Design a protein around this ligand. Structure first.
Ligand SMILES: Nc1ncnc2c1ncn2[C@@H]1O[C@H](COP(=O)(O)OP(=O)(O)OP(=O)(O)O)[C@@H](O)[C@H]1O
Ligand SMILES: Nc1ncnc2c1ncn2[C@@H]1O[C@H](COP(=O)(O)OP(=O)(O)O)[C@@H](O)[C@H]1O
Ligand SMILES: Nc1ncnc2c1ncn2[C@@H]1O[C@H](COP(=O)(O)OP(=O)(O)O)[C@@H](O)[C@H]1O
Ligand SMILES: [Mg+2]
Lengths: 320, 67, 1158
């Protein structure tokens, strides 16, 4: 019901790429909550647009001088530049960067600041654009983005891994029932699991895939590194057993079934078939409870509290 | 600007002079200047304690601080 | 001629230092040829310094030179940098050590001392006929080099060092190849283990194990190989007890490895299917070998989880092998996964779970010694980047222990360097740039971090840095397995049941005790109790009594009072019994030391001394905690003296207060003005004991006591010192080893702000209550006062004067009385005893001409006065009358009322002691004029009397009551004391106090801070002691400094790292009551050493009296108003009283009236 307004009266939405593509401003400021970063999105965006980035973290006078030289050179000749954690150099960003910004057609500057961090200066924030990076609420949207970011067994394993990552990221935002604590699974875990999958599939050329090896290594080593409580570890292992069972018939979603790859197809038609079986799947309204195999009561409690806070905020807003 | 200014003013007002400024070479220069001034003014003081207490008396008599 | 001898010794030490500096300069430049051309100005300066040194030597044979040498030492910075560029392992050496290692162009013996700092596992080199033939590890095992390395006079250090570094790997590979050939020949390992270096046997056994496991796993049988492995383990255990110590350690490591092999085989045999067996074979670490590689140093690779690593073949010696728990295997797997993509493996979790030891075990399994660093708040971006560029050129694995300790700004700034290193390793870059200088990048290096989250004072990782690491949790260690295999390897008859019993006992003790902060029974306590049960087997034997005695000796001193009973009940109900140790010689030594020092050997004190000795017998770092003035200093001092008597080893102690110095003065500071390192105090002590120039520190124990609160920011920099590493890691890359005889103690009062990281790592000794009887304490104080000074008759009669039976009842009844500056009565005996002894020693010159009854009555009156003004000396008026009534009740003796005072030789009062004042008109402008009243003269007399007793006096009272007034009145009429005025504020430092005394004192060496006058003492009057504020961890710099200056009678000089001794400086302070807003509480550890007095507001009638004398003196100007002097005084007093009553502090913050207004 909350997303119905956006799905009905709003026909277009913007990502980071559309913001950086359709802005006359040459400066951008990115933001994210605690223990999440969006540097990799800017790296991939720069690689897609064929531009050279310069990651210049702040916090020390030597790094500040290097940033000054790099920003001067990039203004003179072009190219991109990025500043990481500008809140750790508050005096510098209050004086020098404010003086520079307040004062080339291929010169863009990106800054990352925490939402929970210290308050950035008002004129500098007002002068530059603002983008907030956060995890995508849509499970199928997450699968779509992970699929678009990337023999046929490698492609099938990448598809299964993307589904596993999206499912566990959807589960990790449920505090009281999804896990013991609040955990975040960023892109590095997905990269490590994909590299391990390719390493396993390359070595074992007998086509007798050791699904137990992949299951245990993903649950224990790659995705289980940040796990502290035993209950989180066992529920992660259970979901990995549910998704990575490696059977001929596989039901990761109560409405979606995935055929296993054949020994005569090429990678491109396999990718086309997987995209086709992805797109034909429609997300149910109760996907937060039915897909993750959870009891309904906690899901409805979380949704009710979120909608109550949202509706109270909009009722306090709409009275003036 | 910062509480060290307050501490210096507190030291100046509690005693009559700041011991921090006159340390080592500066202390020796102040001793020589005070000896020259006392000899020029017309008193007979040669020991360090009497000269420094005369300095304390002078700075207590001729300095007023308004906050 | 003690001062002359000290001056001669100082001159000799300075001459030796100058000779060493000139020797280094001559070695680098003055002797070797064709080395002046690198820097011509430095060459000319070296020639001038050579001329100066020749002139000085000629003058000595028949200062400024030292300053010139220090100035030209900065000119060698770029030369030292390029020399460190020549050999990357020089980045672990100090600048002076690098001077020593370059200047030794022909000795070739200076290298062995520094090789422990460089390599980390080799402390000596065997030299024969000016050639290298042997290399010796830290455990004493000698590795024979494959080929002898010749030495020439022309070749300097780095070339032959590189040749030796290559030959180390070549010799290790040759020994491994021979051992593997012997094992493939089919011989038993019992003959092989006595032939080669341990690493060869270890890796060849691992290779044979994985090859045979693969061969058996091709089929589906395991019983034959399991039986063979079991018989091999049994035969090795039989061989263990009949060999030398080096062979014993080698055999112990081999048992650890073969027991891990047997565990894996047992895991695989109990499998049913084949897939689960292949799973458990894939997870465990495997040691394969390349068969087609013509290269020799890369012929062995390690496979785990499908990933591959290369064995570095670096010498590691014999380490303490870790017991292979499943958590250890999973950690090895995640480190392999991180290192496959050249990332950094990260370990995190609660403290004392086996993170740094896990990283070290992984590095030893990969055959490269892992250098460990201890991150600190002084680590800025520059030193961290210097360490990173040092470890990239070396190629060794760096492990930054306690990575959370860095500042968050530095954590954000080092992200670019970490990403650059990772990307250079990934893309195979030949060179990377750090510190604006291109440096070569070795393809072997890697970085690990071991952060400890959830503890206060630690910043969190920014995400750009954490994304460049692979974090793994280490929440629950497998302590039961570790206990089982360690008990098995020590040769205990029963291992599994004993390990289950000890682990379950530790769990029960943790669960069923008084849950307070300083309790932690994790893996560290288990390792400690095993290390303590290791040497008790000689006196007890392997079994149950050994482990229960070890458990007692490890755990009991760290418990409270009822928790001791709980522990004893649990140990009785979980183990069979507890023959006790005779301990006759040690208790005889303690009793002799106590009799020598005058202490009383009570049951509690003797038990505490026994517990301390038994804990320190193997534990290196101890922490002594308890209430203020329990007797911790007495305990460790008397046990040090008893140890010196017992063993014959000389004992030296260094008393350092941690909170009185900054970190930059304690551990050291890097001067950014010249990029040069300055050693702190503890670093200076460690360097002096490590270098051992004098040769007398070999057979002498070294003790460093930290007599202050356990600040985490000040003590957690010792994380790599107190643990099993025992290496101090300075910011500039210096790695100082800790000798076994170097022991560290801690002395504090609270453990609320301390962290479990520095609690588990050190032994603990909790003092539940006081250790000595009050009567015995008084006897000790009397003994020390007698020894501080016919005399024997006077001592006998004053000892007979005391009646402790009434004294203890008076002490127990004194608690009902109200007190300020809350201190227990157990601390206030010092002022009473010292005052009584000083009074009797002062009045003894008139004690030779009177009868015994009058003498006894006078002495009893003096004792009454001292007891009153000590116990109730910090109380109000009515309280003081109540206490003097009580002490008159509890003692035929001479009566002592509220105003009883001896007169110069009978009893009198202050009724006749008031002198008339001729207060002239113009004298009211003098601030020092005093109107003597009863309370004024009484307080002045007692203040002068206390100050003459060589003590510390703290005068308390509401503002304006007359504290400094009576002090100035007392010390003005005396021609023996000088007053210095120091006023504190919200931020006052130790440097301010030292700066206010520089113009009043003179430094003399014998160091000693004498007063400028040779006849007059100096009274350090520090006013408003409560004003200096706390820091962020509940401590006060100035108060702790004053406590150091009062008790230890000295302080440590910061910029010179030398101890000074105070001689004739007395400490007198003034403080408002703590209940006054804006004032803050002060520790009992400082008020213990000083006597406290109350100076209250005088009565309104007394104010009227003193101000009617003031008004008569002021109306001497106008003679016809002399009859109106009293109404004005009464009006002024009444107006002041009504103004104070009406306008309180609750209206405005500055409505604080005082008699100063009047
Ligand atoms: N067995 C004993 N016999 C006699 N006196 C004793 C005995 N044990 C302790 N004392 C007395 O206890 C007093 C206080 O003990 P100590 O000097 O060791 O305190 P501390 O541990 O340094 O104190 P704090 O932690 O408060 O600074 C000493 O002055 C000593 O005379
Ligand atoms: N096989 C083992 N497994 C786990 N821990 C061990 C093992 N053997 C010894 N230990 C203990 O683990 C401790 C490691 O301390 P650690 O937790 O790494 O300190 P830090 O957290 O400061 O890095 C050592 O004190 C050591 O006694
Ligand atoms: N003989 C006396 N009896 C009682 N009070 C006195 C006497 N002489 C001076 N005073 C009062 O004591 C005050 C001095 O207080 P002072 O010692 O400066 O307070 P503080 O110790 O807080 O600095 C004077 O203002 C004076 O009014
Ligand atoms: Mg550690």
């Amino acid at each position: 019901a909350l997303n119905w307004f956006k799905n009905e009266f709003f026909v277009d939405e913007w990502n980071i790429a559309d913001v950086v593509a359709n802005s006359e401003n040459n400066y951008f400021t990115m933001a994210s909550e605690r223990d999440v970063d969006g540097t990799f999105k800017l790296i991939e965006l720069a690689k897609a647009s064929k531009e050279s980035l310069k990651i210049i973290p702040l916090g020390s006078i030597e790094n500040l001088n290097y940033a000054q030289e790099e920003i001067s050179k990039s203004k003179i000749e072009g190219g991109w530049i990025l500043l990481q954690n500008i809140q750790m150099s508050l005096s510098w960003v209050k004086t020098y960067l404010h003086k520079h910004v307040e004062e080339h057609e291929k010169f863009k500057m990106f800054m990352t600041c925490h939402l929970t961090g210290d308050k950035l200066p008002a004129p500098l924030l007002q002068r530059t654009d603002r983008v907030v990076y956060e995890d995508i609420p849509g499970i199928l949207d997450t699968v779509k983005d992970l699929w678009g970011s990337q023999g046929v067994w490698s492609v099938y394993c990448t598809f299964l891994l993307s589904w596993f990552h999206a499912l566990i990221t959807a589960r990790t935002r449920l505090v009281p029932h999804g896990f013991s604590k609040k955990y975040y699974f960023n892109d590095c875990d997905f990269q490590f699991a994909s590299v391990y999958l390719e390493n396993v599939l390359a070595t074992n050329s007998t086509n007798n895939i050791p699904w137990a090896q992949v299951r245990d290594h993903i649950a224990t080593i790659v995705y289980g590194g940040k796990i502290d409580e035993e209950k989180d570890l066992e529920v992660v292992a259970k979901l990995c057993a549910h998704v990575f069972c490696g059977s001929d018939n596989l039901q990761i979603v109560p409405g979606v079934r995935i055929p296993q790859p054949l020994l005569q197809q090429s990678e491109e038609e396999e990718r086309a078939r997987l995209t086709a079986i992805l797109s034909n799947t429609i997300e149910p309204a109760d996907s937060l409870s039915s897909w993750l195999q959870l009891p309904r009561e906690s899901i409805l409690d979380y949704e009710r509290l979120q909608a109550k806070e949202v509706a109270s905020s909009t009722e306090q807003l709409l009275q003036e | 600007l910062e509480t060290a200014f307050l501490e210096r003013m507190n030291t100046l007002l509690a005693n009559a002079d700041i011991p921090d400024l006159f340390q080592g070479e500066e202390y020796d220069k102040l001793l020589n200047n005070l000896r020259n001034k006392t000899r020029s003014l017309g008193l007979l003081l040669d020991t360090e304690q009497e000269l420094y207490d005369w300095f304390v008396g002078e700075i207590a008599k001729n300095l007023h601080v308004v906050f | 001629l003690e001062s002359k001898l000290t001056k001669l010794s100082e001159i000799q030490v300075n001459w030796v230092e100058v000779q060493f500096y000139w020797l280094d300069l001559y070695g680098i430049l003055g002797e070797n040829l064709d080395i002046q051309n690198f820097l011509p100005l430095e060459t000319s300066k070296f020639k001038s310094l050579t001329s100066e040194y020749k002139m000085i030597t000629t003058r000595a044979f028949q200062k400024l030179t030292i300053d010139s040498l220090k100035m030209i030492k900065s000119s060698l910075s770029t030369f030292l940098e390029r020399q460190r560029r020549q050999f990357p392992r020089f980045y672990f050496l100090g600048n002076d050590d690098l001077l020593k290692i370059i200047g030794s162009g022909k000795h070739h013996d200076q290298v062995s001392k520094f090789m422990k700092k460089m390599f980390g596992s080799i402390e000596s080199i065997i030299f024969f006929e000016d050639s290298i033939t042997g290399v010796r590890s830290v455990e004493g095992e000698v590795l024979n080099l494959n080929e002898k390395i010749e030495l020439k006079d022309s070749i300097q250090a780095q070339e032959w060092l590189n040749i030796l570094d290559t030959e180390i790997k070549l010799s290790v590979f040759t020994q491994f190849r021979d051992c593997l050939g012997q094992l493939k020949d089919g011989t038993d390992i019992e003959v092989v283990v006595s032939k080669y270096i341990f690493q060869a046997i270890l890796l060849s056994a691992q290779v044979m194990w994985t090859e045979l496991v693969e061969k058996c796993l091709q089929t589906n049988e395991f019983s034959k190989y399991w039986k063979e492995v079991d018989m091999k383990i049994k035969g090795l255990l039989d061989k263990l007890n009949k060999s030398s110590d080096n062979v014993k350690k080698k055999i112990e490591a081999l048992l650890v490895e073969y027991l891990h092999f047997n565990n894996v085989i047992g895991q695989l045999k109990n499998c049913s299917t084949k897939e689960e067996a292949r799973l458990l074979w894939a997870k465990v670490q495997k040691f394969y070998q390349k068969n087609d590689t013509l290269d020799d140093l890369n012929s062995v690779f390690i496979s785990q989880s499908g990933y591959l690593l290369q064995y570095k073949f670096e010498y590691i010696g014999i380490p303490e092998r870790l017991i292979y728990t499943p958590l250890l295997l999973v950690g090895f797997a995640t480190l392999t996964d991180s290192l496959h993509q050249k990332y950094g493996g990260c370990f995190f979790g609660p403290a004392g779970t086996g993170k740094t030891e896990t990283v070290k075990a992984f590095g030893q399994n990969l055959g490269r010694v892992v250098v460990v660093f201890n991150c600190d708040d002084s680590f800025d971006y520059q030193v961290l980047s210097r360490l990173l560029v040092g470890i990239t050129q070396i190629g060794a694995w760096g492990c930054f222990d306690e990575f959370n300790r860095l500042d968050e700004k530095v954590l954000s700034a080092v992200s670019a360097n970490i990403q650059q290193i990772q990307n250079g390793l990934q893309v195979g870059k030949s060179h990377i740039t750090l510190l604006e200088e291109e440096t070569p990048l070795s393809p072997h290096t890697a970085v690990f971090i071991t952060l400890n989250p959830g503890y206060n004072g630690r910043s969190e990782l920014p995400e750009n840095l954490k994304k460049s690491f692979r974090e793994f949790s280490m929440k629950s260690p497998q302590s039961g397995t570790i206990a089982e295999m360690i008990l098995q390897i020590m040769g205990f008859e029963d291992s599994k049941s004993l390990a289950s019993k000890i682990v379950h006992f530790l769990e029960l003790l943790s669960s069923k005790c008084s849950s307070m902060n300083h309790y932690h029974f994790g893996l560290r306590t288990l390792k400690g109790v095993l290390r303590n049960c290791s040497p008790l087997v000689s006196e007890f034997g392997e079994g149950e009594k050994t482990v229960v005695e070890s458990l007692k000796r490890v755990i009991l001193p760290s418990l409270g009072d009822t928790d001791e009973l709980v522990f004893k009940d649990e140990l009785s109900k979980i183990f069979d019994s507890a023959t006790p140790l005779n301990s006759k010689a040690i208790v005889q030594c303690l009793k002799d030391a106590g009799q020598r020092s005058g202490f009383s050997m009570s049951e509690e004190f003797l038990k505490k001394c026994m517990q301390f000795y038994y804990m320190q017998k193997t534990q290196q770092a101890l922490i002594l905690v308890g209430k203020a003035g329990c007797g911790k200093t007495a305990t460790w001092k008397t046990v040090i003296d008893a140890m010196a008597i017992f063993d014959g080893h000389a004992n030296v102690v260094y008393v350092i207060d941690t909170k009185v110095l900054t970190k930059e003065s304690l551990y050291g500071s890097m001067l950014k003005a010249t990029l040069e390192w300055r050693d702190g105090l503890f670093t200076s002590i460690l360097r002096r004991v490590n270098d051992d120039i004098t040769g007398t520190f070999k057979n002498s124990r070294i003790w460093v006591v930290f007599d202050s609160d356990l600040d985490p920011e000040y003590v957690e920099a010792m994380n790599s010192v107190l643990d099993d590493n025992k290496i101090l890691t300075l910011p500039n890359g210096e790695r100082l080893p800790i000798p076994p005889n170097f022991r560290i103690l801690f002395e504090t009062d609270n453990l609320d702000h301390t962290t479990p990281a520095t609690i588990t790592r050190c032994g603990l000794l909790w003092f539940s209550t006081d250790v000595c009887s009050i009567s015995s304490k008084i006897d000790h104080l009397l003994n020390k006062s007698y020894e501080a000074l016919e005399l024997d008759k006077l001592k006998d009669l004053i000892s007979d004067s005391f009646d402790m039976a009434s004294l203890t009842n008076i002490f127990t009844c004194s608690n009902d009385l109200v007190h300020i500056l809350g201190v227990r009565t157990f601390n206030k005996l010092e002022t009473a005893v010292q005052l009584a002894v000083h009074l009797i020693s002062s009045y003894r010159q008139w004690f030779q001409n009177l009868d015994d009854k009058s003498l006894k009555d006078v002495i009893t009156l003096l004792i009454k006065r001292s007891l009153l003004y000590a116990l109730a000396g910090d109380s109000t008026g009515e309280s003081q009358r109540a206490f003097i009534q009580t002490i008159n009740t509890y003692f035929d003796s001479q009566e002592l009322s509220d105003y009883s005072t001896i007169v110069i030789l009978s009893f009198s009062s202050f009724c006749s002691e008031i002198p008339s004042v001729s207060l002239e008109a113009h004298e009211v402008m003098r601030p020092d004029i005093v109107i003597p009243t009863i309370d004024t003269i009484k307080h002045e007399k007692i203040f002068y009397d206390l100050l003459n007793s060589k003590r510390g006096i703290i005068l308390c009272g509401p503002p304006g009551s007359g504290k400094t007034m009576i002090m100035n009145n007392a010390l003005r009429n005396s021609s023996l004391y000088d007053v210095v005025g120091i006023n504190f504020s919200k931020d006052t430092t130790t440097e301010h106090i030292l700066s206010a005394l520089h113009r009043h004192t003179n430094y003399v060496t014998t160091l000693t801070l004498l007063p400028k006058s040779d006849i007059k003492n100096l009274v350090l009057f520090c006013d408003e002691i409560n004003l200096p504020k706390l820091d962020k961890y509940g401590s006060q710099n100035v108060v702790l400094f004053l406590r150091q200056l009062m008790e230890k009678q000295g302080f440590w000089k910061t910029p010179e790292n030398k101890w000074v001794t105070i001689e004739r400086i007395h400490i007198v302070g003034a403080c408002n009551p703590p209940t006054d807003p804006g004032r803050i509480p002060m520790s009992e550890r400082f008020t213990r050493h000083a006597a406290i007095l109350y100076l209250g507001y005088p009565s309104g009638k007394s104010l009227s009296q003193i101000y009617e004398i003031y008004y008569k003196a002021i109306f001497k100007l106008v003679p016809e108003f002399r009859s109106y002097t009293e109404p004005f005084a009464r009006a002024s007093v009444h107006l002041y009283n009504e103004c104070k009553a009406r306008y309180s502090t609750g209206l405005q913050s500055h409505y604080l009236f005082s008699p100063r207004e009047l």
